[PDB]
Design an enzyme around this catalytic site. Structure first.
Site, mmCIF file in Angstrom:
data_model
loop_
_atom_site.group_PDB
_atom_site.id
_atom_site.type_symbol
_atom_site.label_atom_id
_atom_site.label_comp_id
_atom_site.label_asym_id
_atom_site.label_seq_id
_atom_site.Cartn_x
_atom_site.Cartn_y
_atom_site.Cartn_z
ATOM 1 N N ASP A 1 5.501 17.085 12.750
ATOM 2 C CA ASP A 1 4.680 17.883 11.579
ATOM 3 C C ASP A 1 3.462 17.171 10.792
ATOM 4 O O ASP A 1 4.007 16.107 10.493
ATOM 5 C CB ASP A 1 5.619 18.762 10.620
ATOM 6 C CG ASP A 1 6.412 19.695 11.169
ATOM 7 O OD1 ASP A 1 6.338 20.088 12.506
ATOM 8 O OD2 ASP A 1 7.143 20.360 10.684
ATOM 9 N N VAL B 1 4.251 -1.055 4.169
ATOM 10 C CA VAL B 1 3.004 -1.325 4.523
ATOM 11 C C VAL B 1 2.256 -2.035 3.502
ATOM 12 O O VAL B 1 2.245 -1.834 2.177
ATOM 13 C CB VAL B 1 2.013 0.238 4.705
ATOM 14 C CG1 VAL B 1 0.656 -0.187 5.221
ATOM 15 C CG2 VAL B 1 2.800 1.031 5.744
ATOM 16 N N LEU C 1 0.810 -1.421 -0.102
ATOM 17 C CA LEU C 1 0.008 0.086 0.130
ATOM 18 C C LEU C 1 0.839 1.250 0.003
ATOM 19 O O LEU C 1 0.323 2.484 -0.533
ATOM 20 C CB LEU C 1 -0.986 0.021 1.401
ATOM 21 C CG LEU C 1 -2.173 0.695 1.475
ATOM 22 C CD1 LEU C 1 -2.273 1.024 2.915
ATOM 23 C CD2 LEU C 1 -2.661 1.476 0.281
ATOM 24 N N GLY C 2 2.094 1.092 0.672
ATOM 25 C CA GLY C 2 2.990 2.237 1.091
ATOM 26 C C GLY C 2 4.359 1.688 1.353
ATOM 27 O O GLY C 2 4.316 0.520 1.787
ATOM 28 N N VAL C 3 5.414 2.561 1.026
ATOM 29 C CA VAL C 3 6.725 2.298 1.543
ATOM 30 C C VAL C 3 7.401 3.618 1.768
ATOM 31 O O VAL C 3 6.991 4.543 1.483
ATOM 32 C CB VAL C 3 7.602 1.416 0.202
ATOM 33 C CG1 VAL C 3 8.699 1.474 0.689
ATOM 34 C CG2 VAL C 3 6.952 0.082 -0.247
ATOM 35 N N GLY C 4 8.150 3.748 2.932
ATOM 36 C CA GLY C 4 8.878 4.626 3.249
ATOM 37 C C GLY C 4 10.350 4.132 3.552
ATOM 38 O O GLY C 4 10.842 3.110 3.422
ATOM 39 N N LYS D 1 1.903 -2.435 8.946
ATOM 40 C CA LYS D 1 3.216 -1.712 8.793
ATOM 41 C C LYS D 1 4.353 -2.767 9.202
ATOM 42 O O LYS D 1 4.244 -3.195 10.312
ATOM 43 C CB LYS D 1 3.117 -0.273 9.342
ATOM 44 C CG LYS D 1 4.573 0.206 9.423
ATOM 45 C CD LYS D 1 4.472 1.619 10.005
ATOM 46 C CE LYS D 1 3.497 2.562 9.555
ATOM 47 N NZ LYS D 1 3.884 3.940 9.988
ATOM 48 N N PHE E 1 11.349 3.774 6.482
ATOM 49 C CA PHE E 1 11.285 2.829 7.604
ATOM 50 C C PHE E 1 10.682 1.519 7.540
ATOM 51 O O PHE E 1 11.051 0.621 8.032
ATOM 52 C CB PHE E 1 10.662 3.577 8.978
ATOM 53 C CG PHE E 1 11.395 4.916 9.280
ATOM 54 C CD1 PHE E 1 10.833 5.626 10.136
ATOM 55 C CD2 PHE E 1 12.752 5.090 8.689
ATOM 56 C CE1 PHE E 1 11.250 6.854 10.495
ATOM 57 C CE2 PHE E 1 13.156 6.625 9.158
ATOM 58 C CZ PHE E 1 12.718 7.227 10.118
ATOM 59 N N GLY E 2 10.078 1.459 6.464
ATOM 60 C CA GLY E 2 9.533 0.017 6.103
ATOM 61 C C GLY E 2 8.411 0.002 5.026
ATOM 62 O O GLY E 2 8.485 1.002 4.096
#
Length: 256
Positions: free
Chosen positions: A130, A21, A13-16, A36, A18-19
């Site tokens: 933020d 999802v 679904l998502g990646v950053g 996550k 840090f890991g």
């Protein structure tokens, strides 16, 4: 092939940094969660383990209807699995880019939800982070949901003080961010936008922006207060709650 209880993990679904999802689907009921996955070795190499752990602990204590829920945390010697609430409707800004500006009362409804969730963060989040407009998602019921899933890093198809080089108060920067969200909901575009970067920055520091003919004076004043360049002069959440435009049809449950 990975399962948590009855949940089979599927698409990412998502990646950053840090890991990742991944969506989990319950084999029997079709219930979905968002998992996550945090690889210990990667978060160690970024030296963020402490921050992340403290974030997990704080999220256990969150109970707001417009902020993503954490259901459980599974720890292994190699990974953390955070089983979280699934959101189906993608990023708010993507919805706005696809469908255009939102009708005024819908803009207000969504913005009330978002501001409530930010107020809850300022009150309950121990260390401030933020607000990122790309973290405002839409759920199945077209309600706003704040989540940090890295959807915006998947490809298929800043406040004045942020760019000042100074340290700043996070809650104030959040008000500016909410002002751009409100402007985007109402106008279908960003209030400071320019392909020439120094001009984008000059526009943000200058604080002058365009109000379309179709918006009323009332909401224009709210946007003006939220987008004040000098934080000393900028709207607080209390000020916004007191504004005649924002007050309209405001559910009491949002600010208890």
């Amino acid at each position: 092939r990975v399962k948590i209880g009855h949940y089979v993990l599927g698409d990412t679904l998502g990646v950053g940094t840090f890991g990742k999802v991944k969506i989990g689907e319950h084999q029997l009921t079709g219930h979905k969660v968002a998992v996550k996955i945090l690889n210990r070795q990667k978060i160690r190499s970024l030296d963020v383990v402490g921050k992340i752990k403290r974030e997990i602990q704080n999220l256990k204590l969150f109970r707001h209807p417009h902020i993503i829920k954490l259901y459980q945390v599974i720890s292994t010697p190699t990974d953390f699995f955070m089983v979280m609430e699934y959101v189906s409707g993608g990023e708010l800004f993507d919805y706005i880019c696809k469908h255009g500006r939102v009708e005024e009362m819908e803009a207000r409804r969504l913005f009330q939800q978002i501001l409530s969730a930010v107020d809850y963060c300022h009150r309950h989040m121990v260390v401030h982070r933020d607000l990122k407009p790309e973290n405002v998602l839409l759920d199945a019921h077209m309600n706003a949901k704040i989540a940090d899933f890295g959807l915006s890093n998947m490809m298929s198809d800043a406040a004045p003080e942020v760019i000042s080089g100074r340290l700043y108060a996070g809650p104030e920067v959040d008000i500016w961010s909410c002002g751009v969200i409100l402007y985007a909901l109402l106008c279908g575009t960003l209030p400071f936008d320019d392909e020439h970067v120094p001009t984008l920055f000059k526009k943000i520091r200058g604080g002058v922006f365009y109000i379309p003919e179709y918006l009323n004076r009332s909401v224009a004043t709210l946007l003006m207060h939220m987008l004040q360049v000098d934080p000393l002069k900028r709207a607080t959440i209390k000020d916004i709650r007191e504004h005649e435009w924002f007050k309209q049809d405001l559910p009491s449950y949002l600010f208890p």
